[PDB]
Structure formats: structure tokens, C-alpha cells
Design a protein around this ligand. Structure first.
Ligand SMILES: [Cl-]
Ligand SMILES: [Cl-]
Ligand SMILES: [Cl-]
Ligand code: NA
Lengths: 5, 99, 99
């Protein structure tokens, strides 16, 4: 899992 | 505390009287929690991640405890794979990255 | 250093002989870099986050310099909107979260 803008 | 990164940096949060687990995430501008009820009005926001953009509900001035530290600020609610504590609240609890 | 989180924690990296800017991302299990060539064997992988999943190429035993600190590990390459240094390489440079 990678994870925000 | 000092948290190493060999495992996911998961902590307990308290929001709406409810305990939840969340990830401390320095790569997130904003705090994002799974679907739940929060008080007050919300406003629209679009956020971007690795897979593209999603719509979320923005709730301002929400009281949340993070690893026993009090914060009051913006919480986004939407379909996130994991609850994430982002820089907007990491700065409130005094967190820094060190190496 | 000690990096505060008022701003995105962006650092310079060197990978494949190239300088890039990357985000130090404690919410990321893995390191993901924008499309580039790397030497050796790779295999396909799917990785996910907010917004869903993307397909990447997985390269193992890649060396990267992160803010002057050398580390080796797996690097994923694909259409990510931001270069991300994840926990698999943050551990190697001794990064911790502190509050
Ligand atoms: Cl805030
Ligand atoms: Cl690795
Ligand atoms: Cl360690
Ligand atoms: Na390799």
C-alpha cells in the first residue's frame, strides 16, 4: 500500500 | 515517542468517541478517514493519490486524539484503503521526521 | 536532519545516475519512482492507494542516494504522480517519526 495531495 | 519504520506506523486515534487505527503519513497533506458520521456541515474536496483522484467530504474543526495527543482540525471522509493522519494534524502534535 | 512537516518533505535523490526530487512517505510500504530505465531484471506488480491501483515494474537490489545517504532495496517504477521514498528505504537511512 502506497499512501495524498 | 520515537517510531521506527520497519512496520507500518499505526497508532490509535479517537474521534466521535470511537477508537480507530490510523497510519501516520508524512506523504499525505491531509487526514483521511473511512466512512463515519461527523457533526456539522461538510464541503467538497478532491484528493489525489497513487491511483488517481477521489471525492471526499471535508469537515472542519473536528476534535481528534492521536496517540494520546489532542488535535482539532480538518478531517476528510471517503473511500481510503486505510485511515491516514496527514501533515495537517501531524504538525499539531509536533511530529518531525529525523534521520 | 530533522524535517518539520509544515511543508511536503521533499528531498533530492540520486538513482540510475539521475537526480530527482522525491517525497519521504511514511505511509508508503514501497518506493515508487516515475518512469525511467533501471538495469537488470524486473517483474510486474500492482500497487494501490487512494484512487485505486497502478501497474509498475519491480526492480530489486537497486542503490539510491537519499539526501546524501546511500541505501539499497527494491524500487518500483511506473506512472506515479510523485516520486515516493517508502519505508523499505527509509528504514535503511535510519528515519524515525518523533513527537
Ligand atoms: Cl487542519
Ligand atoms: Cl526492499
Ligand atoms: Cl533501527
Ligand atoms: Na536487480
Amino acid at each position: 500500500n502506497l499512501x495524498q495531495i | 515517542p520515537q517510531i521506527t519504520l520497519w512496520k507500518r506506523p499505526l497508532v490509535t486515534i479517537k474521534i466521535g468517541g470511537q477508537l480507530k487505527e490510523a497510519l501516520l503519513d508524512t506523504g499525505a497533506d491531509d487526514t483521511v478517514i473511512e466512512e463515519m458520521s461527523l457533526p456539522g456541515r461538510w464541503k467538497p474536496k478532491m484528493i489525489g493519490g497513487i491511483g488517481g483522484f477521489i471525492k471526499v467530504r471535508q469537515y472542519d474543526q473536528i476534535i481528534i486524539e492521536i496517540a494520546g495527543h489532542k488535535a482539532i482540525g480538518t478531517v476528510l471522509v471517503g473511500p481510503t484503503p486505510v485511515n491516514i493522519i496527514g501533515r495537517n494534524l501531524l504538525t499539531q502534535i509536533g511530529a518531525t521526521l529525523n534521520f
